[PDB]
Amino acid sequence: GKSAVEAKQEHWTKWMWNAIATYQLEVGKHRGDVMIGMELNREDDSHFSGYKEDFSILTPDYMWPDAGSGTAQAYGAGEGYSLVSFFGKMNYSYADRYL
Amino acid sequence: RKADLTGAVSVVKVDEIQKQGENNPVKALQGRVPGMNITADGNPSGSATVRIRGIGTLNNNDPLYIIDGVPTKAGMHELNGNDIESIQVLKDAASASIYGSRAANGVIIITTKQGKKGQIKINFDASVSASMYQSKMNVLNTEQYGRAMWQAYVNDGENPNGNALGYAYNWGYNADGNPVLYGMTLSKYLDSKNTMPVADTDWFDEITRTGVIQQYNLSVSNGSEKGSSFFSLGYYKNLGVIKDTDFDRFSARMNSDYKLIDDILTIGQHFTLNRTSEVQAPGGIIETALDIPSAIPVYASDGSWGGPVGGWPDRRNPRAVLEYNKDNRYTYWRMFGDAYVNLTPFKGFNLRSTFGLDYANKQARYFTYPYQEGTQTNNGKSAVEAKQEHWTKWMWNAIATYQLEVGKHRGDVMIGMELNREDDSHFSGYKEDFSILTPDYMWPDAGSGTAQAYGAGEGYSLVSFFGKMNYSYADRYLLSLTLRRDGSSRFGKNHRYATFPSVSLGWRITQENFMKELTWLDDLKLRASWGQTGNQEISNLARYTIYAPNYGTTDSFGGQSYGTAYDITGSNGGGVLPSGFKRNQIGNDNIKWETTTQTNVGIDFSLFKQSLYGSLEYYYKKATDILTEMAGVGVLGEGGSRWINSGAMKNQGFEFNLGYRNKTAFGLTYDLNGNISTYRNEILELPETVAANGKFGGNGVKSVVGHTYGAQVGYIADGIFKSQDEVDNHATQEGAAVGRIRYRDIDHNGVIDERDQNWIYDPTPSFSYGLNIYLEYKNFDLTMFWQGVQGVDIISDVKKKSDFWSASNVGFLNKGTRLLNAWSPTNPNSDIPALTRSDTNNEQRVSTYFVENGSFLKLRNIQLGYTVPAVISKKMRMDRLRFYCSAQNLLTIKSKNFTGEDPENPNFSYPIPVNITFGLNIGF
Amino acid sequence: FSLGYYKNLGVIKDTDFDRFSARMNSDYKLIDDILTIGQHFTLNRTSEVQ
Amino acid sequence: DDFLDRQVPQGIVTGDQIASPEYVDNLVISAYAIWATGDDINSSFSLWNYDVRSDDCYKGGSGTEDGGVFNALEISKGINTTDWNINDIWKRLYQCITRANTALQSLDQMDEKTYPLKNQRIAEMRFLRGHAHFMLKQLFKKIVIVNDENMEPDAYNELSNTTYTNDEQWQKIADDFQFAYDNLPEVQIEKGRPAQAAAAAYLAKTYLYKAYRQDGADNALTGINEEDLKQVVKYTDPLIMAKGGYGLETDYSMNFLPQYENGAESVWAIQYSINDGTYNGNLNWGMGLTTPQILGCCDFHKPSQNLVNAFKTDSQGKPLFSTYDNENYEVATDNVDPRLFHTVGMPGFPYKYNEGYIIQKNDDWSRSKGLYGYYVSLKENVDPDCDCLKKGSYWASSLNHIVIRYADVLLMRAEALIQLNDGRITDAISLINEVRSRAAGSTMLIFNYKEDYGVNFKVTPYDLKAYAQDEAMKMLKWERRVEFGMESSRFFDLVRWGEAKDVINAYYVTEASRCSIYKNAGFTENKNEYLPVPFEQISASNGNYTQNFGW
Amino acid sequence: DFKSGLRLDGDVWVNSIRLDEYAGTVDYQNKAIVVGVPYDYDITRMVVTEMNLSEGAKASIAIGETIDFSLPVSLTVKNGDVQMSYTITVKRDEA
Ligand SMILES: OC[C@H]1O[C@@](CO)(OC[C@H]2O[C@@](CO)(OC[C@H]3O[C@@](CO)(OC[C@H]4O[C@@](CO[C@]5(CO)O[C@H](CO)[C@@H](O)[C@@H]5O)(OC[C@H]5O[C@@](CO)(OC[C@H]6O[C@](O)(CO)[C@@H](O)[C@@H]6O)[C@@H](O)[C@@H]5O)[C@@H](O)[C@@H]4O)[C@@H](O)[C@@H]3O)[C@@H](O)[C@@H]2O)[C@@H](O)[C@@H]1O
Ligand SMILES: OC[C@H]1O[C@@](CO)(OC[C@H]2O[C@@](CO)(OC[C@H]3O[C@@](CO)(OC[C@H]4O[C@](O)(CO)[C@@H](O)[C@@H]4O)[C@@H](O)[C@@H]3O)[C@@H](O)[C@@H]2O)[C@@H](O)[C@@H]1O
Ligand SMILES: [Mg+2]
Ligand SMILES: [Mg+2]
């Protein structure tokens, strides 16, 4: 006769900022591009949950942690990470034949 | 363009709304609309309270905001205000009824910017401001505090050296025998442990700072008949004057519309995403700063927070409170979208179907760090709260409109169906017994103590069928008829639906042939309207007899938790106690809609070729069957509160808008927009228990019926006694002595008691006015908005804590500076009662002493701007470059009867700072 | 501008998955070819019983 | 079109479902729990807030302004019918009554065969309702008798506090205790529930209060009724108590130590618990203000030098009936009842039997800087180190609150016998001697005081000889005063006896010297022996409630 | 702008005192100064020889004055507008 409810919430938030500088050139049969970029990424995750027991009516409408009348538990955690990157890409083409 | 054109509509000019540089556009339009009251405390968020046409009902009086056709009651401080194209306030029932079933308190229609046809523009606005704390309450320093306490002791006739707070007084008498204080000395350490050195501390300066405001907006619009779009980004950040309180907001708005086929099937949308993070001040932080005496050092000897020790009064360190509260930051995501499709089968017909969405998500994490400030401690309690809330409101609307232009007759008919559904939920976890005590470590998993879980949910639904018919003859006679059938989920099946009619008439007198020769009178229109609107803003579970299993897990102050859990076995707990149910309220199955009837009569005029324009309106609002939550009779016990239709409110008001714009011979373009308004409020009927307990006025002493909402009853203070002869000649009263307040004998019975009370407070201003001045001259524009309120009374508690010694619950608290100039035989020319340690006279009672004249006139905004000349701007490729420097809340004038400061904010709420701003606008 | 609705009732009873979606992309070219400002945004709401 | 019907209330039970048979035990537990969770700091069901009007105690706190309305009650001057405390206590007691009435209404519609304990549960609910009515009757002379469980909420407005006279109201109160005595089990394994002995004792108390007639508009005594005293003697018979297994504890301190909860003398007690899933536990928040300043704050409920002098005894071993208050009690040169060191914590002595805390006459123990003296009540406080105690914004303990004590039953029986005066004064003297003998033997925790602080204990019983009725009554009053000090019944006993005015005026005159708050004190002959009916309630029930005499 | 100008800094500590040719042990927790004498010294006439308190600190007891120390003697050290009280006691090395 165990009755319980879990109310769980999770958040994920990732934001990225990117910067690019590109140059192209068409000297004769030579076609050359150069790109320099900087990128920052940051991800933050979190979550938390409540847990309640000892309900009476036993229906989703009635089953809320306030309506519970038993042992309660609370869980919660958070984490995150960051990335930084500097990249450079150079493309050269001769006679539209050698890349 | 007044949209309705035949009702009480006020059009607000955003070109000077944006000038005030405020986060909340509602707060920006504080005094620029007649018959509207905006109250803002001054916290970093722009949160403000709105009251249209005075108080209209005994329930939530908040007006209904409609952004791009989607109604909402959420505050606008969480929405970007720099992308507003037009604002119209509909204050009449007839005009505002068509915009929703929640229009009883007035409607604010906000139209966001849209891509102007055939052109593309971009605007970048930047603004940096400093906010300074001006209304610094003057509290006693250490020497002044010692002098005041000595004065109190000698007036009471007790030995001042018995103060036992470390003061040692050298004092004597003058020739007349009046005590005089030669000097004072202090014990260096307030405690025997030599941990709390005595110091002179400015608590208000310590908790206040100079805040910084940053604002950056970037909008780009692009419009054509091929379709239009508009994209806006916005960032706002505000550091409050109170330390460790702040508010920032990111905003992104995306509007677009597409016209397909040729003119059929117009599909448009408006979406906006906002992210606001905020740290708020703890409750009563200003109160704590005022109370704590200046002798307490901020830091103890060992570097820990200083606090009360020994005989000093128990008040927490306000700086420590702010430091511990600085981590209680909440995040709030707001998501306001809508998508509409418009079909035009032929020339006169239109079918518009709109779907709106409003999703809000609030996530917070509150901490409870252990504190030990002298004798103030929470026994090393450490805890964490993880709270989450969700609000989801969606609306679906369908409209069918037909227009006809037969001859001089112009007639439109619109039939609409609207469905609204709101669902709210929230849940929280609570953990204790942490070790590291830092926000990084403080998570419910890391906790190692007792845990609690809270959670609730609710919602409601609305259905509405409305019909609006407008007829116009010769563009001279205007008639409007609207009818609504509204139902809400908050009522029983029998009383679910209600019908509300409204009629409006208008006559353009200037169009009549008999007054053609009056060429100076450019335009004159006389309009009248009578409408009924419905109110159902009550609790969702209003008609049910609620029994809740309140186990008592919710924190409560004083232990009156009313929980349901008894150690029936008798073992001091140790497990899960048996639980039960308790009654929250008694159901009422006969509740129905509250009916608000409004009659409006207006005259709009324009003279000298639209050079002198204005309006004059008179309105009468009558609210009946007001859904009020009447309390129990008293022997009915808990849960006796029940909703009932037993109310009646009356509001008569006048509004007068004026505006004069003209150029000048030497090239000075001046524009003056004046405004003045007044209203009278009254309660006509009220349930007996409501009148008895006086939640709406009367303090529970006399019924408020027949008086203004919120009016209070108290004694009447006829000065203070100045001689034993005066004390004897006055009617007898307990605690009367020399220097005490003399209370008038109202009933002439010869004795002062609880029957000697009368109406003393009326929270209705005589009139409120505003004035906006705009001067343009040689690329220089000066804007000045003044706002004034006249004839308003305010109940003051700062006066209670500054004019009296030992009037608070606990003694020896720090008081205001004006306490020093109290009455004494050495200082006869005064009106402040003599100091005393015992409140024998019971001067805490409600009386005219605490009623102050709140009339004021403050320069709400001033702004000086320079526009770079067009030639330089074009050379720089910018279409428009502008710089400006502005000041908000710079200057104020108050009546001499107002002892305190800042009559707008006369109590311990958040202070209102002075903002000095510098900003620029670029229009590439 | 895109709107989308998907709903799936699984072969196993009392398991299902539905999704609302709204996408809004735009870009603007200003001056003559300088300062191109664009954005792509999408909002999705998926409810599921597994 | 179920669009307006799809959503339903969340996390609640409706009134129709609350009548289901399986919620009856839940409602019973609710009606019990209101007695532990429905009391505020300023309104505790122990009624110590309103017992400051007596001579036992002052009001603690920083000063006269800390609870100014209670200072007004204590000095009996400037009391207004529009005082928040009066209305608050009225509303709280009636809230308890209504929760019990809801439980009774649910019980009365249940099959006895299916629910065998129906009569016992009904008796318990009636007992709780009668207890709340008794408290209301003590505080306000004229109360509304809400004893009809099957009454609609709309019908409550028609109730009046003058439907029954004073005697009828007392009888209506006693009817619930009579039913509870008839139907309750003799012994309750489940300690929280009342037992038949408790019901009988409390019924005897109701009849004892009923005997002292208050006929007429004024609040003056109008004779003593013999039938009520006969009923008191009938229902206080030692056979009932022996059947319930109740009796005096071997030591006086066991009634207040946390280690001996639910003892033999604890006839009935409000159960307070700790570590039970509640946010802070069902602690005694009502006594949250009474903790000493050393525990952290609020220093309320301070006993009085008059009470200490009353505790002082003579050389023979009897209380000083006339000269006790002439001089302050001297620790070294006066014989003193040992009950003093269980009731009042004097300076220079251990606080609640803890040698680590010695009471001092400094600000570390008095919040008012000597305005209210330096004595600390001990009956409701606990040792700081017994982890009985918790900081929930107010230091509160899990110590149970005893409502009925076997000493109270014995003194009640003695009073009944003395008032009857049918040649049975000797039995009352025997009961008084039994209580005094218990007090004299109660020195297990204070034995070292003789050699550590020079305390002389000297208490002796009385010879079993004929005593005059007035002499016996005087001795009984003294015994009650020294036995139930700080237990919040002194003022009620003074009102019942009728000498409240004289005793209070004498106390004011005597204590004005050693406490400056009594400079302007004054007790009115027929106005201040009862709290006024709240003005808010009178206004709400227009033309139904009548204010007490003298207002 | 807010300071009262009451010069609360005022160090009032007592380093040591010397009664005749005997030093005194100073306890700051209870503000006591105990001086021992060889169980026969005349404790009715002692001249305060040296007493160093602090910079700007003045004591009620001067230097060079004779005092009866049969009972504890109260000493007040004042600096600026603050003060501290000590009790000086002399004991005859009782065993
Ligand atoms: O309701 C109608 C009418 O009644 C009024 C009239 O004043 O009050 C009565 C109404 O309020 C209650 C609150 O439940 O009773 C309050 C009542 O309690 C008194 C006398 O009994 O004193 C009780 C003690 O409470 C203390 C505790 O101090 C502290 C402060 O937090 O608590 C913990 C304990 O260690 C520590 O942090 C402190 O020691 O004071 C709390 C009391 O102070 C109030 C009263 O206005 O506000 C003052 C300041 O206290 C703060 O907490 C400061 O940080 C802030 O909240 C505020 O600035 C209020 O907060 C608390 O009630 C201690 O000082 C007292 O000795 C009286 O003080 C007081 O009258 C109810 O029981 C009762 O119904 C009004 O509320 C109303 O008009
Ligand atoms: O819970 C249902 C019901 O409660 C409301 C109002 O009663 O708010 C829920 C709780 O959120 C509170 C926190 O105390 O909001 C106050 C602060 O939070 C903000 C977020 O920016 O306001 C939230 C949201 O609600 C309004 O305030 C409407 O009153 C809106 O202005 C705003 O968008 C912030 O503005 C405040 O500083 C508080 O209101 C409640 O405890 C309702 O949101 C909900 O319907
Ligand atoms: Mg009078
Ligand atoms: Mg217990």
Author numbering:
A (entry chain I): 472 to 570
B (entry chain A): 93 to 1016
C (entry chain I): 323 to 372
D (entry chain B): 2 to 552
E (entry chain T): 4 to 98
What does the publication say?
Glycan uptake across the bacterial outer membrane (OM) of these bacteria is mediated by SusCD protein complexes, comprising a membrane-embedded barrel and a lipoprotein lid, that is thought to open and close to facilitate substrate binding and transport. Transport-competent FOS are generated from levan by a surface-exposed lipoprotein, a GH32-family levan endo-glycanase (GHlev), while an SGBP (SGBPlev) is thought to recruit levan at the cell surface. Single particle cryogenic electron microscopy (cryoEM) structures in the absence and presence of substrate reveal concerted conformational changes that demonstrate the mechanism of substrate capture, and rationalise the role of each component in the utilisome.
All SusDlev lids are closed, tightly capping the extracellular face of the SusClev barrels, relative to the open position in the apo utilisomes. 3D classification reveals that the major source of heterogeneity present in the data was the presence of sub-complexes missing one or more accessory lipoproteins (ED Fig. 3b), so to probe substrate binding within the closed transporter complex, we first performed targeted refinement of the SusCDlev core, using particle subtraction to remove the signal for GHlev and SGBPlev from the images. (3) Binding of the oligosaccharide to SusCD promotes lid closure and signalling to the plug, breaks the aromatic lock and exposes the Ton box to the periplasm.
